[PDB]
Amino acid sequence: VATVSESFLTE
Amino acid sequence: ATVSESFLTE
Amino acid sequence: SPDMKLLAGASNWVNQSGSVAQFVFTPSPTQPQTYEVSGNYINNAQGTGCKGTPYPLSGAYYSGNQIISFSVVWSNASANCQSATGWTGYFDFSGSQAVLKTDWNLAFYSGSTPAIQQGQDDFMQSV
Amino acid sequence: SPDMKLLAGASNWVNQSGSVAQFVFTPSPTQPQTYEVSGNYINNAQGTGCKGTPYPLSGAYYSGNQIISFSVVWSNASANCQSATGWTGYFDFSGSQAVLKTDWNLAFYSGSTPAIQQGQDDFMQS
């Protein structure tokens, strides 16, 4: 399943 | 439809 | 929960100009937690063209943290302002009244000169 | 003309960082001289998440003077950046190389704090 990142700017 | 130069100026 | 009532219905939102967005959400067939935005926008802003009639809107919404981006092309049966606006922002349900905070860009021509004007709309839910 | 064949929905538009927008147009059901925009966007912006995979895009395009506004929610099968970007701008077909000039906004969270970041992308037709 997709990886989750805090935001488009920050992992 | 009535045509305006743009959303700002008619 | 406020997030799910938004998904289940057609909700109306009034900005500081008195303009009104009505949003409908349809699940994306490919993007998890993502919704196709449909609905209409009525412009009531002073000094502007294309006022007082609904324009369709389109865009996308992310349910995980209630972020939205949607657009209007200013062409309908009533008036054509030869332009488009895109809004991007987020919903805040933390207060007693829900607010949608956005930044917008308006692309248009003045004579033969193109330009993109920036602004901010804060929409308060109609309940 | 160049504003035609944009409409073919066949081409790539590449920005200064190598991100790629692939537009598809369908006539608007109700708006004259307007198209619904679909397609995919492949991000390559330096330092950002959600690079290198297609994300659907949606929006609307005004063919009278070639103005467009489209958006991407950064959620797909590969990566979710819990964010959305909207671009708004215009096609300049006057030079020998066509350019899509846009301003964009990116909405995202940093911790529990929401924010909206601004930028500019120019896309050249490949």
PDB file of C-alpha atoms in Angstrom:
ATOM      1  CA  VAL A   1       0.000   0.000   0.000  1.00  0.00           C
ATOM      2  CA  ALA A   2       1.039   3.649  -0.469  1.00  0.00           C
ATOM      3  CA  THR A   3       3.736   5.217   1.738  1.00  0.00           C
ATOM      4  CA  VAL A   4       2.518   8.008   4.001  1.00  0.00           C
ATOM      5  CA  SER A   5       4.362  11.298   4.352  1.00  0.00           C
ATOM      6  CA  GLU A   6       3.460  14.129   6.714  1.00  0.00           C
ATOM      7  CA  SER A   7       3.304  16.471   3.697  1.00  0.00           C
ATOM      8  CA  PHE A   8       4.385  17.093   0.133  1.00  0.00           C
ATOM      9  CA  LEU A   9       7.353  19.013   1.656  1.00  0.00           C
ATOM     10  CA  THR A  10       8.351  16.780   4.600  1.00  0.00           C
ATOM     11  CA  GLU A  11       8.511  13.036   5.214  1.00  0.00           C
TER      12      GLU A  11
ATOM     13  CA  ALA B   1     -23.648  35.548 -23.202  1.00  0.00           C
ATOM     14  CA  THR B   2     -22.553  39.064 -22.336  1.00  0.00           C
ATOM     15  CA  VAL B   3     -18.808  39.162 -22.931  1.00  0.00           C
ATOM     16  CA  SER B   4     -16.536  41.086 -20.553  1.00  0.00           C
ATOM     17  CA  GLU B   5     -12.865  41.770 -21.343  1.00  0.00           C
ATOM     18  CA  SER B   6     -12.209  39.945 -18.027  1.00  0.00           C
ATOM     19  CA  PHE B   7     -13.527  39.146 -14.550  1.00  0.00           C
ATOM     20  CA  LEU B   8     -12.159  42.582 -13.352  1.00  0.00           C
ATOM     21  CA  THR B   9     -12.911  45.054 -16.221  1.00  0.00           C
ATOM     22  CA  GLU B  10     -16.152  45.071 -18.256  1.00  0.00           C
TER      23      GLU B  10
ATOM     24  CA  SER C   1     -18.834  13.979  12.497  1.00  0.00           C
ATOM     25  CA  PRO C   2     -18.375  17.276  10.534  1.00  0.00           C
ATOM     26  CA  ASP C   3     -15.962  15.660   7.966  1.00  0.00           C
ATOM     27  CA  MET C   4     -18.609  13.007   6.994  1.00  0.00           C
ATOM     28  CA  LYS C   5     -21.588  15.404   6.796  1.00  0.00           C
ATOM     29  CA  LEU C   6     -19.544  17.345   4.238  1.00  0.00           C
ATOM     30  CA  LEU C   7     -19.092  14.163   2.135  1.00  0.00           C
ATOM     31  CA  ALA C   8     -22.739  13.122   2.410  1.00  0.00           C
ATOM     32  CA  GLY C   9     -24.311  16.362   1.236  1.00  0.00           C
ATOM     33  CA  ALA C  10     -24.368  19.550  -0.761  1.00  0.00           C
ATOM     34  CA  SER C  11     -23.082  22.232   1.549  1.00  0.00           C
ATOM     35  CA  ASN C  12     -22.966  25.959   1.073  1.00  0.00           C
ATOM     36  CA  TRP C  13     -20.149  28.354   2.046  1.00  0.00           C
ATOM     37  CA  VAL C  14     -20.183  32.182   1.976  1.00  0.00           C
ATOM     38  CA  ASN C  15     -16.973  34.220   1.624  1.00  0.00           C
ATOM     39  CA  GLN C  16     -16.079  37.698   2.797  1.00  0.00           C
ATOM     40  CA  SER C  17     -17.354  39.170  -0.559  1.00  0.00           C
ATOM     41  CA  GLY C  18     -20.728  37.519  -0.158  1.00  0.00           C
ATOM     42  CA  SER C  19     -19.941  34.966  -2.874  1.00  0.00           C
ATOM     43  CA  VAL C  20     -21.216  31.404  -2.341  1.00  0.00           C
ATOM     44  CA  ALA C  21     -19.656  27.990  -3.091  1.00  0.00           C
ATOM     45  CA  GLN C  22     -21.784  24.836  -3.044  1.00  0.00           C
ATOM     46  CA  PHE C  23     -19.767  21.586  -2.949  1.00  0.00           C
ATOM     47  CA  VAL C  24     -20.686  17.994  -3.829  1.00  0.00           C
ATOM     48  CA  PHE C  25     -18.143  15.165  -3.331  1.00  0.00           C
ATOM     49  CA  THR C  26     -17.890  11.899  -5.300  1.00  0.00           C
ATOM     50  CA  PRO C  27     -15.319   9.248  -4.428  1.00  0.00           C
ATOM     51  CA  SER C  28     -12.354   8.988  -6.791  1.00  0.00           C
ATOM     52  CA  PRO C  29     -12.205   5.638  -8.595  1.00  0.00           C
ATOM     53  CA  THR C  30      -8.368   5.556  -8.231  1.00  0.00           C
ATOM     54  CA  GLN C  31      -7.177   7.832  -5.441  1.00  0.00           C
ATOM     55  CA  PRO C  32      -7.731   6.664  -1.897  1.00  0.00           C
ATOM     56  CA  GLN C  33      -9.402   9.172   0.521  1.00  0.00           C
ATOM     57  CA  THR C  34      -9.887  11.463  -2.426  1.00  0.00           C
ATOM     58  CA  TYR C  35     -13.065  12.951  -3.890  1.00  0.00           C
ATOM     59  CA  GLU C  36     -13.995  14.614  -7.182  1.00  0.00           C
ATOM     60  CA  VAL C  37     -15.437  18.088  -6.344  1.00  0.00           C
ATOM     61  CA  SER C  38     -18.483  19.282  -8.242  1.00  0.00           C
ATOM     62  CA  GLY C  39     -20.963  22.009  -7.449  1.00  0.00           C
ATOM     63  CA  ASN C  40     -21.369  25.661  -8.309  1.00  0.00           C
ATOM     64  CA  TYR C  41     -20.099  29.102  -7.435  1.00  0.00           C
ATOM     65  CA  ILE C  42     -22.047  32.367  -7.324  1.00  0.00           C
ATOM     66  CA  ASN C  43     -19.981  35.514  -7.494  1.00  0.00           C
ATOM     67  CA  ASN C  44     -21.304  38.495  -5.524  1.00  0.00           C
ATOM     68  CA  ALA C  45     -18.023  40.466  -5.319  1.00  0.00           C
ATOM     69  CA  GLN C  46     -18.187  44.213  -5.849  1.00  0.00           C
ATOM     70  CA  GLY C  47     -16.564  45.685  -8.979  1.00  0.00           C
ATOM     71  CA  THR C  48     -16.393  42.351 -10.795  1.00  0.00           C
ATOM     72  CA  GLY C  49     -17.975  40.762 -13.855  1.00  0.00           C
ATOM     73  CA  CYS C  50     -19.983  37.519 -14.019  1.00  0.00           C
ATOM     74  CA  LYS C  51     -22.029  38.240 -10.873  1.00  0.00           C
ATOM     75  CA  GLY C  52     -25.163  36.684  -9.520  1.00  0.00           C
ATOM     76  CA  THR C  53     -25.334  33.432 -11.551  1.00  0.00           C
ATOM     77  CA  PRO C  54     -24.008  29.918 -10.887  1.00  0.00           C
ATOM     78  CA  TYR C  55     -20.780  28.716 -12.481  1.00  0.00           C
ATOM     79  CA  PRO C  56     -19.802  25.080 -12.285  1.00  0.00           C
ATOM     80  CA  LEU C  57     -16.810  24.197 -10.209  1.00  0.00           C
ATOM     81  CA  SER C  58     -14.473  21.232 -10.439  1.00  0.00           C
ATOM     82  CA  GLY C  59     -11.457  19.954  -8.557  1.00  0.00           C
ATOM     83  CA  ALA C  60     -10.402  17.468  -5.918  1.00  0.00           C
ATOM     84  CA  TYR C  61     -10.608  16.960  -2.158  1.00  0.00           C
ATOM     85  CA  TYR C  62      -8.511  14.931   0.277  1.00  0.00           C
ATOM     86  CA  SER C  63     -10.592  13.613   3.174  1.00  0.00           C
ATOM     87  CA  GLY C  64      -7.644  12.557   5.431  1.00  0.00           C
ATOM     88  CA  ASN C  65      -7.019  16.145   6.566  1.00  0.00           C
ATOM     89  CA  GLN C  66      -9.826  18.030   4.703  1.00  0.00           C
ATOM     90  CA  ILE C  67      -7.784  19.839   2.037  1.00  0.00           C
ATOM     91  CA  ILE C  68      -9.402  21.052  -1.178  1.00  0.00           C
ATOM     92  CA  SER C  69      -8.443  22.551  -4.543  1.00  0.00           C
ATOM     93  CA  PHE C  70     -11.124  23.652  -6.994  1.00  0.00           C
ATOM     94  CA  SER C  71     -11.608  25.844 -10.037  1.00  0.00           C
ATOM     95  CA  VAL C  72     -14.094  27.883 -12.019  1.00  0.00           C
ATOM     96  CA  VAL C  73     -13.973  28.907 -15.653  1.00  0.00           C
ATOM     97  CA  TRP C  74     -16.080  32.067 -15.922  1.00  0.00           C
ATOM     98  CA  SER C  75     -18.275  30.987 -18.917  1.00  0.00           C
ATOM     99  CA  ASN C  76     -21.951  30.206 -18.628  1.00  0.00           C
ATOM    100  CA  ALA C  77     -25.245  30.973 -20.364  1.00  0.00           C
ATOM    101  CA  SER C  78     -25.472  34.387 -18.658  1.00  0.00           C
ATOM    102  CA  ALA C  79     -21.991  35.887 -18.940  1.00  0.00           C
ATOM    103  CA  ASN C  80     -18.472  35.105 -20.064  1.00  0.00           C
ATOM    104  CA  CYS C  81     -15.547  36.876 -18.343  1.00  0.00           C
ATOM    105  CA  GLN C  82     -12.926  34.982 -20.379  1.00  0.00           C
ATOM    106  CA  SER C  83     -11.001  33.924 -17.310  1.00  0.00           C
ATOM    107  CA  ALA C  84     -10.563  31.250 -14.625  1.00  0.00           C
ATOM    108  CA  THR C  85     -10.027  31.087 -10.929  1.00  0.00           C
ATOM    109  CA  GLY C  86      -8.381  28.368  -8.841  1.00  0.00           C
ATOM    110  CA  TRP C  87      -8.773  28.053  -5.075  1.00  0.00           C
ATOM    111  CA  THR C  88      -6.665  25.888  -2.796  1.00  0.00           C
ATOM    112  CA  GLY C  89      -6.932  25.541   0.926  1.00  0.00           C
ATOM    113  CA  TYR C  90      -8.296  23.675   3.902  1.00  0.00           C
ATOM    114  CA  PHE C  91     -11.367  23.243   6.153  1.00  0.00           C
ATOM    115  CA  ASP C  92     -11.282  24.020   9.862  1.00  0.00           C
ATOM    116  CA  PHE C  93     -14.057  22.383  11.852  1.00  0.00           C
ATOM    117  CA  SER C  94     -12.515  23.225  15.258  1.00  0.00           C
ATOM    118  CA  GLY C  95     -14.818  26.182  15.963  1.00  0.00           C
ATOM    119  CA  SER C  96     -18.579  26.268  16.472  1.00  0.00           C
ATOM    120  CA  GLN C  97     -18.883  27.399  12.837  1.00  0.00           C
ATOM    121  CA  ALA C  98     -16.852  25.661  10.097  1.00  0.00           C
ATOM    122  CA  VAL C  99     -14.495  27.788   7.904  1.00  0.00           C
ATOM    123  CA  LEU C 100     -12.777  27.053   4.592  1.00  0.00           C
ATOM    124  CA  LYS C 101      -9.553  29.048   4.237  1.00  0.00           C
ATOM    125  CA  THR C 102      -8.178  29.451   0.688  1.00  0.00           C
ATOM    126  CA  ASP C 103      -5.732  31.268  -1.490  1.00  0.00           C
ATOM    127  CA  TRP C 104      -6.810  31.897  -5.078  1.00  0.00           C
ATOM    128  CA  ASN C 105      -5.365  32.774  -8.470  1.00  0.00           C
ATOM    129  CA  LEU C 106      -7.328  34.507 -11.217  1.00  0.00           C
ATOM    130  CA  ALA C 107      -5.968  34.213 -14.755  1.00  0.00           C
ATOM    131  CA  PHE C 108      -7.273  36.732 -17.280  1.00  0.00           C
ATOM    132  CA  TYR C 109      -6.374  39.144 -20.110  1.00  0.00           C
ATOM    133  CA  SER C 110      -6.235  42.899 -20.117  1.00  0.00           C
ATOM    134  CA  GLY C 111      -6.214  43.716 -23.818  1.00  0.00           C
ATOM    135  CA  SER C 112      -3.576  41.426 -25.258  1.00  0.00           C
ATOM    136  CA  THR C 113      -1.721  41.203 -21.903  1.00  0.00           C
ATOM    137  CA  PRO C 114      -2.187  38.062 -19.739  1.00  0.00           C
ATOM    138  CA  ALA C 115      -1.944  38.247 -15.963  1.00  0.00           C
ATOM    139  CA  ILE C 116      -2.548  36.154 -12.856  1.00  0.00           C
ATOM    140  CA  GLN C 117      -3.879  37.979  -9.822  1.00  0.00           C
ATOM    141  CA  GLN C 118      -3.665  36.509  -6.278  1.00  0.00           C
ATOM    142  CA  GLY C 119      -6.004  36.813  -3.265  1.00  0.00           C
ATOM    143  CA  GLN C 120      -7.479  35.024  -0.290  1.00  0.00           C
ATOM    144  CA  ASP C 121     -11.033  33.900   0.463  1.00  0.00           C
ATOM    145  CA  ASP C 122     -12.345  32.776   3.803  1.00  0.00           C
ATOM    146  CA  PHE C 123     -15.698  30.977   3.511  1.00  0.00           C
ATOM    147  CA  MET C 124     -18.018  30.462   6.503  1.00  0.00           C
ATOM    148  CA  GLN C 125     -20.430  27.539   6.369  1.00  0.00           C
ATOM    149  CA  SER C 126     -24.148  28.219   5.830  1.00  0.00           C
ATOM    150  CA  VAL C 127     -26.104  26.310   8.354  1.00  0.00           C
TER     151      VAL C 127
ATOM    152  CA  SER D   1      -2.706  26.237 -34.953  1.00  0.00           C
ATOM    153  CA  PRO D   2      -0.946  25.481 -31.643  1.00  0.00           C
ATOM    154  CA  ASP D   3      -4.107  25.979 -29.451  1.00  0.00           C
ATOM    155  CA  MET D   4      -5.484  23.110 -31.515  1.00  0.00           C
ATOM    156  CA  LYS D   5      -3.509  19.901 -30.932  1.00  0.00           C
ATOM    157  CA  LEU D   6      -3.269  20.985 -27.329  1.00  0.00           C
ATOM    158  CA  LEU D   7      -6.806  19.651 -27.558  1.00  0.00           C
ATOM    159  CA  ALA D   8      -5.671  16.360 -29.119  1.00  0.00           C
ATOM    160  CA  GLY D   9      -4.669  15.363 -25.521  1.00  0.00           C
ATOM    161  CA  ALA D  10      -1.473  13.787 -26.881  1.00  0.00           C
ATOM    162  CA  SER D  11       1.333  15.911 -25.392  1.00  0.00           C
ATOM    163  CA  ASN D  12       3.620  16.441 -22.373  1.00  0.00           C
ATOM    164  CA  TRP D  13       4.184  19.741 -20.619  1.00  0.00           C
ATOM    165  CA  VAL D  14       7.421  19.834 -18.684  1.00  0.00           C
ATOM    166  CA  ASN D  15       8.354  22.356 -16.024  1.00  0.00           C
ATOM    167  CA  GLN D  16      11.615  23.796 -14.882  1.00  0.00           C
ATOM    168  CA  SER D  17      12.231  20.815 -12.527  1.00  0.00           C
ATOM    169  CA  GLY D  18      11.182  18.131 -14.992  1.00  0.00           C
ATOM    170  CA  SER D  19       7.718  17.563 -13.548  1.00  0.00           C
ATOM    171  CA  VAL D  20       5.292  16.497 -16.287  1.00  0.00           C
ATOM    172  CA  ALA D  21       1.657  17.355 -16.904  1.00  0.00           C
ATOM    173  CA  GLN D  22      -0.246  15.207 -19.406  1.00  0.00           C
ATOM    174  CA  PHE D  23      -3.615  16.889 -20.168  1.00  0.00           C
ATOM    175  CA  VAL D  24      -6.764  15.324 -21.548  1.00  0.00           C
ATOM    176  CA  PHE D  25      -9.717  17.547 -22.562  1.00  0.00           C
ATOM    177  CA  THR D  26     -13.470  16.725 -22.926  1.00  0.00           C
ATOM    178  CA  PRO D  27     -16.129  19.313 -23.828  1.00  0.00           C
ATOM    179  CA  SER D  28     -17.899  20.826 -20.846  1.00  0.00           C
ATOM    180  CA  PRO D  29     -21.486  19.563 -20.610  1.00  0.00           C
ATOM    181  CA  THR D  30     -22.846  23.056 -19.850  1.00  0.00           C
ATOM    182  CA  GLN D  31     -20.198  25.754 -20.310  1.00  0.00           C
ATOM    183  CA  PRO D  32     -19.557  27.251 -23.744  1.00  0.00           C
ATOM    184  CA  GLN D  33     -15.946  27.253 -24.985  1.00  0.00           C
ATOM    185  CA  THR D  34     -14.890  25.250 -21.983  1.00  0.00           C
ATOM    186  CA  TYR D  35     -13.369  21.804 -21.456  1.00  0.00           C
ATOM    187  CA  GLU D  36     -13.125  19.519 -18.473  1.00  0.00           C
ATOM    188  CA  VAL D  37      -9.451  18.712 -17.829  1.00  0.00           C
ATOM    189  CA  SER D  38      -8.245  15.291 -16.823  1.00  0.00           C
ATOM    190  CA  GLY D  39      -4.920  13.459 -17.195  1.00  0.00           C
ATOM    191  CA  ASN D  40      -1.904  12.832 -14.972  1.00  0.00           C
ATOM    192  CA  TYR D  41       0.914  14.719 -13.353  1.00  0.00           C
ATOM    193  CA  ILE D  42       4.349  13.304 -12.586  1.00  0.00           C
ATOM    194  CA  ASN D  43       6.159  15.325  -9.917  1.00  0.00           C
ATOM    195  CA  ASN D  44       9.875  15.980  -9.883  1.00  0.00           C
ATOM    196  CA  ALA D  45      10.115  19.116  -7.729  1.00  0.00           C
ATOM    197  CA  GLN D  46      13.337  19.287  -5.745  1.00  0.00           C
ATOM    198  CA  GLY D  47      13.001  18.238  -2.127  1.00  0.00           C
ATOM    199  CA  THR D  48       9.372  17.178  -2.382  1.00  0.00           C
ATOM    200  CA  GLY D  49       7.578  13.928  -1.703  1.00  0.00           C
ATOM    201  CA  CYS D  50       5.396  12.010  -4.133  1.00  0.00           C
ATOM    202  CA  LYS D  51       7.900  12.111  -6.975  1.00  0.00           C
ATOM    203  CA  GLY D  52       8.079   9.939 -10.050  1.00  0.00           C
ATOM    204  CA  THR D  53       4.561   8.403 -10.210  1.00  0.00           C
ATOM    205  CA  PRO D  54       1.390   9.504 -11.951  1.00  0.00           C
ATOM    206  CA  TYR D  55      -1.228  11.430 -10.025  1.00  0.00           C
ATOM    207  CA  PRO D  56      -4.567  12.220 -11.602  1.00  0.00           C
ATOM    208  CA  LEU D  57      -5.294  15.852 -12.292  1.00  0.00           C
ATOM    209  CA  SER D  58      -8.598  17.646 -12.688  1.00  0.00           C
ATOM    210  CA  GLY D  59      -9.831  21.057 -13.626  1.00  0.00           C
ATOM    211  CA  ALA D  60     -11.190  23.207 -16.407  1.00  0.00           C
ATOM    212  CA  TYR D  61      -9.876  24.952 -19.532  1.00  0.00           C
ATOM    213  CA  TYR D  62     -11.250  28.002 -21.383  1.00  0.00           C
ATOM    214  CA  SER D  63     -10.442  27.675 -25.107  1.00  0.00           C
ATOM    215  CA  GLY D  64     -11.336  31.257 -26.076  1.00  0.00           C
ATOM    216  CA  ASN D  65      -8.019  32.628 -24.826  1.00  0.00           C
ATOM    217  CA  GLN D  66      -6.371  29.377 -23.612  1.00  0.00           C
ATOM    218  CA  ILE D  67      -6.579  29.787 -19.842  1.00  0.00           C
ATOM    219  CA  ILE D  68      -6.491  26.770 -17.515  1.00  0.00           C
ATOM    220  CA  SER D  69      -6.862  25.829 -13.853  1.00  0.00           C
ATOM    221  CA  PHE D  70      -6.170  22.302 -12.545  1.00  0.00           C
ATOM    222  CA  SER D  71      -5.454  20.509  -9.323  1.00  0.00           C
ATOM    223  CA  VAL D  72      -3.832  17.378  -7.912  1.00  0.00           C
ATOM    224  CA  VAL D  73      -4.446  15.614  -4.602  1.00  0.00           C
ATOM    225  CA  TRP D  74      -1.177  13.849  -3.676  1.00  0.00           C
ATOM    226  CA  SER D  75      -2.715  10.397  -2.945  1.00  0.00           C
ATOM    227  CA  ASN D  76      -2.133   7.368  -5.121  1.00  0.00           C
ATOM    228  CA  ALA D  77      -1.171   3.702  -4.834  1.00  0.00           C
ATOM    229  CA  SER D  78       2.511   4.584  -4.462  1.00  0.00           C
ATOM    230  CA  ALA D  79       2.629   7.511  -2.043  1.00  0.00           C
ATOM    231  CA  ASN D  80       0.370   9.769  -0.040  1.00  0.00           C
ATOM    232  CA  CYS D  81       1.707  13.228   0.813  1.00  0.00           C
ATOM    233  CA  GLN D  82      -1.628  14.320   2.456  1.00  0.00           C
ATOM    234  CA  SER D  83      -1.596  17.553   0.418  1.00  0.00           C
ATOM    235  CA  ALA D  84      -3.093  19.215  -2.673  1.00  0.00           C
ATOM    236  CA  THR D  85      -1.817  21.665  -5.304  1.00  0.00           C
ATOM    237  CA  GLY D  86      -3.728  23.966  -7.608  1.00  0.00           C
ATOM    238  CA  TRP D  87      -2.246  25.615 -10.678  1.00  0.00           C
ATOM    239  CA  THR D  88      -3.877  28.449 -12.579  1.00  0.00           C
ATOM    240  CA  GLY D  89      -2.525  30.158 -15.664  1.00  0.00           C
ATOM    241  CA  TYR D  90      -2.372  30.579 -19.383  1.00  0.00           C
ATOM    242  CA  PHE D  91      -0.852  29.111 -22.550  1.00  0.00           C
ATOM    243  CA  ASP D  92       1.464  31.360 -24.548  1.00  0.00           C
ATOM    244  CA  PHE D  93       1.700  30.043 -28.112  1.00  0.00           C
ATOM    245  CA  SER D  94       3.317  33.220 -29.506  1.00  0.00           C
ATOM    246  CA  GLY D  95       6.939  31.992 -29.530  1.00  0.00           C
ATOM    247  CA  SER D  96       8.244  28.976 -31.430  1.00  0.00           C
ATOM    248  CA  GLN D  97       8.174  27.030 -28.160  1.00  0.00           C
ATOM    249  CA  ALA D  98       4.770  26.951 -26.445  1.00  0.00           C
ATOM    250  CA  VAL D  99       4.785  27.773 -22.727  1.00  0.00           C
ATOM    251  CA  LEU D 100       2.151  27.265 -20.013  1.00  0.00           C
ATOM    252  CA  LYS D 101       2.662  29.935 -17.376  1.00  0.00           C
ATOM    253  CA  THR D 102       1.196  29.181 -13.991  1.00  0.00           C
ATOM    254  CA  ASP D 103       0.948  30.256 -10.392  1.00  0.00           C
ATOM    255  CA  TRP D 104       0.284  27.529  -7.844  1.00  0.00           C
ATOM    256  CA  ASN D 105      -0.778  26.990  -4.286  1.00  0.00           C
ATOM    257  CA  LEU D 106       0.089  23.964  -2.143  1.00  0.00           C
ATOM    258  CA  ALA D 107      -2.051  23.216   0.912  1.00  0.00           C
ATOM    259  CA  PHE D 108      -0.510  20.911   3.559  1.00  0.00           C
ATOM    260  CA  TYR D 109      -0.024  20.253   7.279  1.00  0.00           C
ATOM    261  CA  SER D 110       3.102  20.658   9.347  1.00  0.00           C
ATOM    262  CA  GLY D 111       2.257  18.920  12.593  1.00  0.00           C
ATOM    263  CA  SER D 112      -1.208  20.121  13.503  1.00  0.00           C
ATOM    264  CA  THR D 113      -0.594  23.432  11.670  1.00  0.00           C
ATOM    265  CA  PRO D 114      -2.210  23.997   8.231  1.00  0.00           C
ATOM    266  CA  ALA D 115      -0.454  26.121   5.642  1.00  0.00           C
ATOM    267  CA  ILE D 116      -0.665  27.252   2.050  1.00  0.00           C
ATOM    268  CA  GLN D 117       2.545  27.767   0.073  1.00  0.00           C
ATOM    269  CA  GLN D 118       2.779  29.766  -3.185  1.00  0.00           C
ATOM    270  CA  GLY D 119       4.961  29.296  -6.261  1.00  0.00           C
ATOM    271  CA  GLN D 120       5.295  29.582 -10.034  1.00  0.00           C
ATOM    272  CA  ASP D 121       5.771  26.860 -12.708  1.00  0.00           C
ATOM    273  CA  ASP D 122       6.397  27.364 -16.404  1.00  0.00           C
ATOM    274  CA  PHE D 123       5.785  24.250 -18.520  1.00  0.00           C
ATOM    275  CA  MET D 124       7.224  23.775 -21.996  1.00  0.00           C
ATOM    276  CA  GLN D 125       5.559  21.494 -24.493  1.00  0.00           C
ATOM    277  CA  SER D 126       7.918  18.577 -25.337  1.00  0.00           C
TER     278      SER D 126
END
